[PDB]
Symmetry: C3
Subunit: 196 residues, 3 copies
Amino acid sequence: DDNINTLWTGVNPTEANCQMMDSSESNDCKLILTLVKTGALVTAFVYVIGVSNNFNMLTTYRNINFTAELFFDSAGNLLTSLSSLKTPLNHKSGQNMATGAITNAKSFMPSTTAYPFNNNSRENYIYGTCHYTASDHTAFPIDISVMLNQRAIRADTSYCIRITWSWNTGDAPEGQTSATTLVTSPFTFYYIREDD
Amino acid sequence: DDNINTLWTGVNPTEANCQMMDSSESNDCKLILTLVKTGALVTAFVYVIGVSNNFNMLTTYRNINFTAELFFDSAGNLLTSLSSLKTPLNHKSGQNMATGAITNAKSFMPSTTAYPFNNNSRENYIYGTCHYTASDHTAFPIDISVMLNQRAIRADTSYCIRITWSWNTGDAPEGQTSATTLVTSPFTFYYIREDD
Amino acid sequence: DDNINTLWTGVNPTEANCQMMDSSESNDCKLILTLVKTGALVTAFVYVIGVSNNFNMLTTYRNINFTAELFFDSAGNLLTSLSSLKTPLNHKSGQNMATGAITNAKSFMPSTTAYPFNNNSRENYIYGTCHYTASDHTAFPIDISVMLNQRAIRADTSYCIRITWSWNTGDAPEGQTSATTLVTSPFTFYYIREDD
């Protein structure tokens, strides 16, 4: 069964499943996250679809960054209370999430052996790029940094994935006319996965 | 059988399988394309090998862009008449194309759930970069755009993939005298795929 | 068995497995390399973790380049005497290398059909980017070149893979004092895989 090789958020959820900004009253966006086991690695594919106004209007600032923090327990279960993503992940079931248990969730996690915790003498950072398309159809470039693991906030935080989208320009992607909706193009990164 | 997880053009076809330029009267290049299923995603691997003289000589201009348009039917069979690629895809058979029927061709296609159709409703694409190597061995950078399912053109056009290669420079990558075959380095992008 | 689809160095070997610099008297770094079969392609995942002082002190210079040269025989076995990597690859066994024989090693190799030997205006180099993280956590960008096949050196050198990391900047990545071990973020590239 190939569907269990995916651990994902589902494609275009009915409602916003992610609270990117602390200032928001509830989930302010749709986080689309797909994790695929591909040999010794995880293929990670992620992007964002703006939902709440204050989030979407971030396009109007010249200097912006927002982070999705995803925290997992010892079994590879998403800790919804601590994480930016507020609905747990599941296997592929069409364009949707399956509803049953997760098979070998742990082997979707970033290797603690390759990406350790609280080790000043090693690094866990992954850097990439993605884009936003403005109303004027110009490709606005978005920086993406990825930090794996690192310090664990809670006693049960056994694995970490943090994704920061940032940008810096003399000009803002968008005006105050608004009537614009923020969406990042997809970013794909790769990491080594933990065993069961 | 792993061979059915790939849908491609085959490696290095005898002669040009793609008519990239509107001005060409026939196939003017070899479009090398690999679509590999990787769980809920498709890994897409693409580059071009110039054949016709007029096509190879694009290296001599300061402002150049070319697009391969791929249209697919409801079963996911390439609509060759409408497409730049004039030869259908089939599974991996060694370094070449297999000759039988295609297994689950639709599950290679870009998801209409993730990528619905824009018929004047919206506007969008996905961005990357690749390079050309000049006779002086210097890496000339080429921009790549990818548009999924933006617009359906004929009644049987169930899926769209458009890929545009462009560059803009004060100098042309090759001189009039230093003119050789146009070849791109491979570009990889990823999309969420439709189900069977 | 999914483990045989992976061919790697293992995670964080106890001792340096790679001699990057010719000036080094023994292995001066840890080469982390993972090759995963992905249909008709191989997903190649590579980065380095510095070990020797001479190698770690590379962080203090403004213009640096180093290359890992990998040569394989007709059976797809790494030729250690010739290669920068001095320890053979094996399949996944947890966070480590398998110890037995290698299953279908040749199919992890770069296609001679796609990437021929010393053939003019044919096949191509691969260019990419990755990063080094300085003490202030600022991302220093590293250019990567990848060369497939191309020139063989010894009579049993049936396959070739070269990886060049280079950089050129107005400032050195680290200060003289704040310098620490040199570690690259992972670079992921793709090639068409030779068959069995």
